[PDB]
């Protein structure tokens, strides 16, 4: 009890108005709960936006406002921008403790798309001594942050042995990821062509070796 809930995902496009809500399991949200709205930006960058229900912190853009909409606290973004794309957390004060909500994932469409750069690396001779062989497929400078990589050994799609990382944000706001195909030294020597195929927003980028 004293469970704070928020929508889990919302999507908007630039210039539109979006309202995020925050509910207390315990009853109506009041002024005394001092609703705080915190913004999470890629790679744990937390920024306080609104405090005490409707007080915008000094450095925050005027497009952010907070209010009590009926029985709940609300965060309204009037004329949403691509950089508003973040996770928004709500927190409510209950006289002796704070309770955070689950957070709302806000997606702003109209972001600028970028196609991945792919590099395929062969297993090293040093690694083969160990009787294992790892092929490394690096993927950088893509946007949005979701790819699909498929691997093929001798034209045949591989089903097992691959591991793909979860995309990470680069300094430049584009994403990166890595895919690994682990074989035994034996398998490595039994086949000839190796291909890393990365699928980003409908397009495919494949790289191969021998």
């Amino acid at each position: 009890q004293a469970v704070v809930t928020q929508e889990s995902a919302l999507t908007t496009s630039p210039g539109e108005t979006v309202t995020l809500t925050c509910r207390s399991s315990t009853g109506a949200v009041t002024t005394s709960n001092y609703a705080n709205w915190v913004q999470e930006k890629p790679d744990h960058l937390f920024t306080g936006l609104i405090g005490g229900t409707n007080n915008r912190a000094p450095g925050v853009p005027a497009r952010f406002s907070g209010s009590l909409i009926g029985d709940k606290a609300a965060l309204t973004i009037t004329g949403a921008q691509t950089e508003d794309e973040a996770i928004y957390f709500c927190a409510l004060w209950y006289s002796n403790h704070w309770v955070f909500g689950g957070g709302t994932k806000l997606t702003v469409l109209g972001q600028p798309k970028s196609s991945p750069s792919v590099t395929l690396f062969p297993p090293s001779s040093e690694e083969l001594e160990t009787n294992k062989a790892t092929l490394v497929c690096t993927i950088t400078d893509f946007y949005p942050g979701v790819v699909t990589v498929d691997w093929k050994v001798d034209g045949t799609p591989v089903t097992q042995g691959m591991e793909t990382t979860q995309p990470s944000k680069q300094s430049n706001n584009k994403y990166m990821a890595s895919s690994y195909l682990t074989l035994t030294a034996r398998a490595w020597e039994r086949h000839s062509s190796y291909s890393c195929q990365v699928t980003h927003e409908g397009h495919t980028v494949e790289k191969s070796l021998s």
Partner: protein
């Protein structure tokens, strides 16, 4: 200026204890309270507690028994002690400043620290094996050649990868780490003018703090 920096142990074993420090700067603890918040992997934020300027503390009731917060005014340090760990205590731990001196009274967490990652596991520290990533396809793609280092089988994170002792800052990419059966594996790549390599040597320097290990691998064709 207002800053908060957390420092903690990195790896801790289930059923043991956790101690983390929040070092503050730009404000005094005799005047401002500090909160402790955690974020479990792929989870939202969870409040742990607060220590007010006057020394009173309040705890999330769920944790109440296992947590304890304290401070050192003169030292600008706040501490969080957490006991009876389970692996679900794995999280990013943050300190944030408490503020209420507004036009109308309200409590707010105004400035957040950057966090410290704590891994709660009974897994063993294991130094990495470093392998060079060379093109294979030695055909001139353009003016640049991209090389790398594969950092395999280490625990716990993190590892530090540098190229020629930091000299090469030139389009260096350190990819996120994959975890397979409690051993992490990561790669790092560097892009250099093709006229250069192999004429001029390229070395990757890997440091594994948890095992106090340093390895250097020269990347040759």
């Amino acid at each position: 200026q207002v800053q908060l920096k957390e420092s903690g142990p990195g790896l801790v074993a289930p059923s043991q204890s956790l101690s983390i420090t929040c070092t503050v700067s730009g404000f005094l603890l005799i005047s401002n309270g500090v909160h402790w918040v955690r974020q479990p992997p792929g989870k939202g934020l969870e409040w742990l507690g607060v220590i007010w300027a006057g020394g009173n503390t309040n705890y999330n009731s769920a944790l109440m028994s296992r947590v304890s917060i304290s401070k050192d005014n003169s030292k600008s340090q706040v501490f969080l002690k957490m006991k009876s760990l389970q692996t679900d205590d794995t999280a990013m731990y943050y300190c944030a400043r408490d503020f209420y001196d507004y036009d109308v009274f309200y409590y707010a967490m105004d400035y957040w620290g950057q966090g410290t990652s704590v891994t709660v596991s009974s897994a063993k520290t294991t130094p990495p094996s470093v392998y060079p990533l060379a093109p294979g396809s030695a055909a001139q793609t353009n003016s640049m050649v991209t090389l790398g280092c594969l950092v395999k089988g280490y625990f716990p994170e993190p590892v530090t990868v540098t190229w020629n002792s930091g000299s090469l800052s030139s389009g260096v990419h350190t990819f996120p780490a994959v975890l397979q059966s409690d051993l992490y594996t990561l790669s790092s790549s560097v892009t250099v003018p093709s006229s250069t390599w192999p004429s001029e040597t390229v070395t990757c320097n890997v440091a594994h703090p948890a095992s106090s290990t340093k390895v250097d691998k020269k990347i040759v064709p």
